[PDB]
């Protein structure tokens, strides 16, 4: 059971361009679809963008989003949501 999702992106790094596109376009729809799921958007520096999914009892898994297009990020988040 997903308990929260953390998305880390770099503000100006090229690798985080797709994640930034997802945030600017698709994040609002994602939050609408999952009103009470904590989707914490945070800024990371000089490191690859990552997606953190904290499940029940504290188990967490991280998937690298480096150089992922917005569609790829949407697919990754949807796969995490579906489980």
């Amino acid at each position: 059971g997903l308990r929260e999702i953390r998305i880390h992106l770099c503000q100006r790094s090229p690798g985080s361009q797709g994640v930034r596109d997802f945030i600017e376009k698709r994040y609002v729809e994602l939050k609408k679809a999952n009103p009470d799921l904590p989707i914490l958007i945070r800024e990371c520096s000089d490191v690859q963008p990552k997606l953190w999914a904290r499940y029940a009892f504290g188990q967490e898994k991280n998937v690298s989003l480096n150089n992922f297009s917005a569609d790829q990020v949407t697919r990754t988040l949807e796969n995490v949501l579906s489980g």
């Binding site: 914490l40 958007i41 009892f57 504290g58």
Partner: protein, 684 residues
């Protein structure tokens, strides 16, 4: 259009209007001064800044003379040295021989400048003057006989503090600084006159006679009394905190600290929790070993899971402790991690950092043209922020408006009103101030965290976001939406994912409640189930501790290295100044130790590993002194419109209306005797 001037023959390019003293700073020479404070206005009364310009018959005051192209500043010429000696002699002619007993002794600009630029003997063969001492309050011990009429206190009170109560009475050698009447100088930044005073004429009454400057060890830290995040230097001698001094950080606090930050360290000396405590058979808390109490809470944690275990975080807790407790409760599958301050969860909430941050940084206030303050008293809630507002108002002609109860902010402001409907009026555009906001090139809107603590906080935030979006539609790099938090731990907790407000705990009463320094009292035993097991982990026993089955002694901000994030989102780390009293231990170490006993050992075993875990949860937490941030206002505003809550008709009233409220607002402040004396002073 840099012009060329020479300081002792060295070419330095300075912008026009630069003072001679500033060019001397540019080449590194520090012209001796007694009346010039860069923060304050220029006065030119000390006369120690008299320097000789080549080919100029008359010496000039470096603090007050704009440079001219081609001028050669002779900072060590015979004329300059002789002028310095004469000015020093005149200063010391009447000054009392109080150095051994003057608290300023050892850190006196008069003493050092006499040793460096003055004669080594006195030609004064007459009687010295004596001045009756004035009483200006319970904080500033005054010996006016030592005053040199540098006028720093007066100018500071007029410009920064904004309280025009200090002035010069009389003429000639009989001229005296101080209130002509028996008035008391009351302000948030009142204590800063002690720092600003070159001589020991104005000194700290609580700190008087306690210690000498050379003895003290200086530790650089960050204050936790407010969410401004003022940098401070904790002065400790022989393992005891002696005083708190401001540390310069141009972005956050220029050179000032609030009175509560400066004088509440006395609270750390009283009502301290030094040993673990467990309820006995009679129901009375008794001192116990760490192992016994930790085992008790470990058994209780093992017994229950999920919503049965919950955590409430106080205003003074640390990010390391927060993440440790968060992981511990998650290992029992509990997400009921709640702060004592309420932030609208509807919409993005904690998901987007820009939602709960002062997006326009404190330094940004200077650039702003119009500031709209909603339901907040920045003078008491965030004193340094109000000081920055006044600085911008004085220099940048900032236009300030307040929607709330009319309060004295030390600067003139437009009082739109106290009813929340004025937010709707601004958003629709019927209100005239909407036009001013639209015309404003750099508008700024600030919504205090106190207003969000009301029932209609979600509606208030939605209305303010509507105002901001209207502004954006009318006209970027600039950020117009800002939230001013009054609790230090709030920003860090929201970043780590702690649920804002205690509402979840109200919805689902927990069997085991862990109070992490929660002295607010939002949740009590009556709300909780009758057999609730309460754990309190904090430095002082104020409210949370007396209603706790187990008391785990914890360290204070002076006694631990921890990350505190200000309202701007800037993360700063405190440094250890004194060891925690008695058996008390650092909070994250306590959480990890309970994790080890309870069979769910958290991964981190050292402070660096805890910081790595913080980086995992939120990378910005470990990036110290960075306010880069990100702009997500579009998404947050879009999320806000989905719900339509209607604001209640109750007028916006800040929790703190008078300076009496400000003194005692937290456990450290309540414990302090000095703050209580100040409360008695203002009240009576």
């Amino acid at each position: 259009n840099l012009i060329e001037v020479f300081v002792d023959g060295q070419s330095v390019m300075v912008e026009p209007g630069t003072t001679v003293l500033q060019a001397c700073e540019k080449v590194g020479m520090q012209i001796p001064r007694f009346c010039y404070h860069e923060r304050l206005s220029v006065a030119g009364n000390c006369r120690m800044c008299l320097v000789e310009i080549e080919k100029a018959p008359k010496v000039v005051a470096a603090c007050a003379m704009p440079v001219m192209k081609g001028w050669n500043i002779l900072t060590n010429s015979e004329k300059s040295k002789k002028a310095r000696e004469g000015v020093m002699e005149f200063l010391l002619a009447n000054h009392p021989l109080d150095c051994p007993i003057c608290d300023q002794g050892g850190e006196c600009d008069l003493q050092d400048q006499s040793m460096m630029f003055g004669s080594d003997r006195s030609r004064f063969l007459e009687g010295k003057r004596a001045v009756e001492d004035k009483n200006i309050g319970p904080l500033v011990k005054t010996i006016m006989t030592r005053c040199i009429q540098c006028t720093r206190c007066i100018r500071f009170a007029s410009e920064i503090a904004g309280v025009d109560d200090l002035g010069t009475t009389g003429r000639g050698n009989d001229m005296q600084v101080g209130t002509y009447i028996e008035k008391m100088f009351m302000s948030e930044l009142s204590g800063n006159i002690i720092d600003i005073c070159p001589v020991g004429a104005l000194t700290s009454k609580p700190y008087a006679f306690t210690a000498r400057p050379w003895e003290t060890r200086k530790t650089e830290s960050i204050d936790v009394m407010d969410a401004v995040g003022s940098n401070i230097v904790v002065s400790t001698r022989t393992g005891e905190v002696m005083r708190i001094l401001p540390r310069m950080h141009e972005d956050i606090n220029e050179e000032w600290i609030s009175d509560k930050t400066r004088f509440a360290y006395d609270g750390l000396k009283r009502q301290r929790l030094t040993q673990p405590m467990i309820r006995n058979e009679k129901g009375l808390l008794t001192y116990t070993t760490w192992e016994d109490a930790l085992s008790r809470v470990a058994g209780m944690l093992q017994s229950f899971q999920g919503n049965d275990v919950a955590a409430i975080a106080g205003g003074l807790v640390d990010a390391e402790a927060l993440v440790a407790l968060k992981d511990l409760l998650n290992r029992v599958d509990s997400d009921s991690l709640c702060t004592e301050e309420v932030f609208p969860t509807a919409g993005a909430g904690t998901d987007l950092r820009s939602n709960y941050l002062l997006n326009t940084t404190i330094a940004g206030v200077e650039e702003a043209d119009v500031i709209l303050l909603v339901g907040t008293n920045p003078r008491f809630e965030a004193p340094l922020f109000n000081a920055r507002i006044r600085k911008s108002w004085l220099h940048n002609d900032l236009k300030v408006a307040l929607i709330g109860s009319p309060v004295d902010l030390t600067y003139r402001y437009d009082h739109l009103g106290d009813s929340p409907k004025i937010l709707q009026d601004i958003a629709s555009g019927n209100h005239p101030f909407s036009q001013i906001l639209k015309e404003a090139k750099k508008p700024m809107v600030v919504l205090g965290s106190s207003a969000l603590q009301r029932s209609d906080g979600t509606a208030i935030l939605a209305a303010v976001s509507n105002i901001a979006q209207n502004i954006r539609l009318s006209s970027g790099d600039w950020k117009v939406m800002n939230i001013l938090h009054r609790i230090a731990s709030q920003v860090a907790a929201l970043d780590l994912g702690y649920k804002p407000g205690v509402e979840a705990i109200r919805k689902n009463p927990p069997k085991v409640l862990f109070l992490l320094g929660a002295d607010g009292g939002c949740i009590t035993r009556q709300d909780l189930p009758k057999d609730c097991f309460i754990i309190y982990q904090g430095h002082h026993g104020d409210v949370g501790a007396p209603m706790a089955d187990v008391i785990l002694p914890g360290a204070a901000y002076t006694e631990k290295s921890a990350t505190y994030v200000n309202t701007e989102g800037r993360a700063q780390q405190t440094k250890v100044a004194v060891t925690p009293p008695g058996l008390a231990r650092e909070d994250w170490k306590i959480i990890r130790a309970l994790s080890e006993i309870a069979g769910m050992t958290l991964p981190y075993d050292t402070l660096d590993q805890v910081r790595s875990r913080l980086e995992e949860v939120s990378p910005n937490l470990v990036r110290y002194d960075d306010v880069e941030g990100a702009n997500y206002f579009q998404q947050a505003n879009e999320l806000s419109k989905l719900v339509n809550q209607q604001l209640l008709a109750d007028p916006l009233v800040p929790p703190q209306l008078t300076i009496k409220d400000f003194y005692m607002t937290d456990s450290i402040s309540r414990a302090s005797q000095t703050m209580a004396k100040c409360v008695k002073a203002v009240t009576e």
